[PDB]
Every structure is written in C-alpha cells, then in structure tokens.
C-alpha cells in the first residue's frame, strides 16, 4: 500500500485528545511490529500523546525504540533527533544518550 494514508491515520490516531496510556500503549505496541523505522511526524504525535498525561518514561522508551530499530547502521537517529529537536527543547525530555541509559 501507500505510506501517506498510513502516516495520516497514525497521526490521526495519536493526536486525538481523549487518549490514555493504555490506548497509546497498545497503539505503539502494534506500531513497533512493522518492518519500518517510524517517520519523525509519527514520533511528534506519539511524544505529544505521551506528554498529554505526564509520563517521562514512555517517551524515553520511544526514543530508545527508535534507537534499537536502527540496526547496525546508526545514521537514522542523528537525522531523527535533528527532526525531533524542537519538541526536545520545548518539552524538557531527555535523549537516552544523555541521562545515562545508553551505558550499561
């Protein structure tokens, strides 16, 4: 199928104001199963949905599921974080490389 209506219904699903952590939880659990590193607009929608009911931890888990889905090549997440950066300095969220979650 095509990707535009796919991304449109996903950003429609996340941006609704009546979301809860269980609904976005199951949405992210069924979104992570695709053979696809998700585009940054999806990650904006997921981050705003996670912000709307006060969770740091799930947002950092969103950032590190963008991390481990990159595989051996690590040119994905610098582009991802340079597309995510305005949400990063308006939200106060932390990348997993900076609060000490990348390290063992």
């Amino acid at each position: 199928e095509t990707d535009e209506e796919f991304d449109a219904r996903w950003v429609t699903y996340f941006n609704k104001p009546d979301i809860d952590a269980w609904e976005l939880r199951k949405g992210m659990n069924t979104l992570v199963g695709y053979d696809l590193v998700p585009e940054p607009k999806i990650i904006d929608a997921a981050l705003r949905a996670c912000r709307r009911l006060n969770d740091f931890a799930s947002a950092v888990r969103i950032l590190e599921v963008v991390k481990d889905k990159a595989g051996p090549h690590k040119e994905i997440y610098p582009y991802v974080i340079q597309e995510l950066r305005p949400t990063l300095n308006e939200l106060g969220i932390s990348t997993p490389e900076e609060l000490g979650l990348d390290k063992v």
């Binding site: 992570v32 199963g33 695709y34 053979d35 889905k69 595989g71 051996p72």
Partner: protein, 227 residues
C-alpha cells in the same frame, strides 16, 4: 570391495551402476545446493538485528513455492526413470545362473547344459590363508564372464536372504516360492565382493558373495574340469 576411509560409492564396472553414479552425483548436486541454501538462510536470518512482528500478507509467494520444488523433483526424476527403464530391456542372455540361499550359505546352479551346482560356505578367521580378508572370503567362488548380459535367477529355502553386490549394482531379495531375475554385465575381469542384505538368523553377518569373472576359454577349461 571396500577400502578404509571410503566416502563415496564402490567404483564402477557395470554400465548400469556407473549411470547410477552419474545420477548419484546429480542428486548430490541437488542435496548440496538445497542444504547449503537452508544452511545460508539459517545462519543468515538468525543473525539479524531488526524485528517485524506485523500481520503480514500470506497469499503472495506460493506460486514459486509450489512450482520450484516440483521443477527440482522432475529434473531429479527424469534420469531416474530414464535409467530405471534401461535395466529391463530386451535381454540377450548368454548365460543363466541360478542361486538359492541356504541356511546361512549359498548355492549356485549352472545347468543350462551339463548340470553343475555347488554350495558356497565361508572361510573361518582361524582357517584363513595369509593375505586374505575377514568376513569376505568364500571357498567356492562364483565364476562369470565379461561383456555379456547374464541373468541371475534367485530363490531360497525358508528364510529371506538377499543376493547383493554393490560394485556391480545388483541387490535382489531371495524369497522362497519366488525366483527373481536380475541382469548383470561386467566390463573388467576380477573378484567383486558383496554380502547378505536381508536378515537370516544367528549367523546373518557371516555369508559373503564373491564374483570371479574371467574370459570364456577358462570357462571351457573350468566347467569341463570341475565335476
């Protein structure tokens, strides 16, 4: 006639079983190709880093998945039937030899003309001539000629034996009440060995078959001077 660290087949004398070797090498190509393919897939896709656990499509790969093993099996089976329908051609039996599998030994009958039969026992280990073999020596050998299509008519008394020589590619089960016809052709003289390939009791490991094949002038000088 085996030798230590032998991995392949027993080397050829009959044209039927050297064509069996050609087909054996072709199916060894096939099993090497598909075993290396599944080995590469197993060592490949267990060594990935990415995940995909969606409800993927199903009915989009079955046409190749159905036709390609059929194509491989039909190129397997075409030489199979090609050589299978070549061991049963119009016989020209220069010689007919009967054998009948006695209780842990054999008997051989050459009675096309001037009736001749003998019973082949086993040489024991403590009675061995120096330089001979263990579990593969017989006092009364089976003498055949070369370059000739010869028939073996096999039978037995009570138990199911099996007349088998792998170097000539012959193996047929000796059954009571049923004589079986097996053709044989040899291109070299010599002594070619085989053993029982059906269980027959408390000495089943102790009957060998030995085929000494010689030219025909020694057949007049041998069968004329045996009885």
């Amino acid at each position: 006639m085996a030798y230590p660290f032998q991995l392949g087949l027993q080397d050829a004398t009959s044209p039927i079983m050297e064509e069996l070797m050609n087909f054996h090498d072709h199916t060894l190509m096939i099993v090497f190709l598909i075993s290396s393919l599944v080995l590469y897939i197993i060592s490949l896709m267990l060594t990935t880093k990415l995940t995909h656990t969606s409800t993927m499509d199903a009915q989009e790969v079955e046409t190749i998945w159905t036709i390609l093993p059929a194509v491989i099996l039909i190129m397997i089976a075409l030489p199979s039937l090609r050589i299978l329908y070549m061991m049963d051609e119009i016989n020209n039996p220069v010689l007919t030899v009967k054998t009948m599998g006695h209780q842990w030994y054999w008997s051989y009958e050459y009675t096309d003309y001037e009736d001749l039969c003998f019973d082949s026992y086993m040489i024991p280990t403590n009675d061995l001539k120096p330089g001979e073999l263990r579990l593969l020596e017989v006092d009364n050998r089976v003498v055949l000629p070369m370059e000739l299509p010869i028939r073996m008519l096999i039978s037995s008394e009570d138990v199911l034996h099996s007349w088998a020589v792998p170097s000539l590619g012959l193996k047929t089960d000796a059954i009571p009440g049923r004589l079986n016809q097996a053709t044989v052709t040899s291109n070299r003289p010599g002594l070619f060995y085989g053993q029982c390939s059906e269980i027959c009791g408390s000495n089943h490991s102790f009957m060998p078959i030995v085929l000494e094949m010689v030219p025909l002038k020694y057949f007049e000088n041998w069968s004329a001077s045996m009885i």
